[PDB]
């Protein structure tokens, strides 16, 4: 009845050593969300910067613009990955 | 897994509102938990510039 972590929320972790004791086999299949645990699907520059700040819960300073020296230092074709 | 690129990216960096009842609690020991969840330091995706902080509602 021992569980080293409460195997309830992410995966059901079942540790094992092998008979030689050299490799640790972990067995951990996924824990599905139960159907009981779900809800059914329900069916001017000043005031604009205050309105965006209060909308997105950030300060005001990232809504003021920046000069051309900062707009043109920017890399417009940045390298992509994955 | 098996999400598309955009909803995986949305799902990872999405920010979570936490509730935190401060009755009979010390203010600094609430402040430590609140501070960790405000910086995003409770996420393994954390980075300073990546802006992954959350919301803490202390009642």
């Amino acid at each position: 009845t021992y569980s080293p972590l409460p195997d309830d929320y992410n995966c059901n972790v079942e540790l094992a050593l092998t008979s030689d004791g050299r490799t640790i086999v972990c067995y951990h299949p996924s824990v599905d969300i139960p159907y009981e645990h779900t809800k059914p699907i329900p069916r001017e520059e000043g005031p604009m910067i205050e309105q965006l700040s209060k909308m997105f819960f950030t300060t005001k300073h990232r809504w003021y613009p920046h000069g051309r020296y900062h707009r043109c230092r920017k890399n417009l074709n940045p390298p992509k990955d994955r | 897994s098996s999400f598309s690129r955009a909803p995986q990216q949305w799902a990872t960096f999405a920010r979570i509102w936490y509730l935190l009842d401060g009755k009979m609690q010390p203010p600094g020991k609430l402040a430590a938990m609140a501070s960790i969840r405000l910086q995003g330091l409770h996420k393994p995706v954390y980075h300073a510039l990546s802006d992954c902080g959350d919301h803490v509602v202390i009642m």
């Binding site: 929320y9 992410n10 009981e36 645990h37 390298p79 | 509730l19």
Partner: protein, 148 residues
């Protein structure tokens, strides 16, 4: 420095090891002066090593131009259309052979900075972390301070 230089991600050209390996070096263009003391080690490279080199990789087409140059060059062209022009000016034959094998072994991608030392295209197998991994659910999907 890294902020002055451009950078890129580590890549291949057309998934160059997956199916088969393709030599990314198409053309070499040696240009060697006949009379000229700077292309001496180029001369002894064409005489000794360029036929052995041209047989060790037949997907490479090699042009020895042998004009009156005052600096000899090797011009590697790559399958993705990159051009690396390097000099073989006042080099020994062995230094030219390590340079030509250096150009053979590499690909046409830039020698600008590489950002990460790796490139998975499928980094996650068990599903990437989102903040609702590692959280338990509640009965009927309730949230804190939800009465019904």
């Amino acid at each position: 420095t890294a902020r002055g230089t451009p950078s890129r991600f580590l890549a291949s050209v057309l998934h160059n090891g997956l199916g088969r390996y393709v030599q990314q070096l198409q053309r070499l263009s040696f240009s060697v002066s006949r009379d000229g003391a700077s292309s001496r080690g180029a001369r002894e490279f064409v005489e000794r090593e360029v036929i052995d080199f041209a047989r060790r990789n037949p997907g490479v087409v090699i042009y020895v131009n042998s004009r009156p140059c005052c600096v000899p060059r090797v011009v590697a062209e790559y399958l993705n259309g990159a051009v690396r022009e390097e000099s073989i000016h006042c080099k020994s034959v062995e230094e030219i052979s390590t340079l030509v094998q250096k150009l053979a072994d590499q690909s046409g991608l830039d020698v600008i900075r590489i950002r990460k030392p790796f490139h998975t295209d499928n980094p996650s197998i068990q599903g990437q972390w989102h903040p609702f991994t590692n959280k338990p659910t509640t009965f009927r999907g309730l949230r804190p301070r939800e009465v019904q």
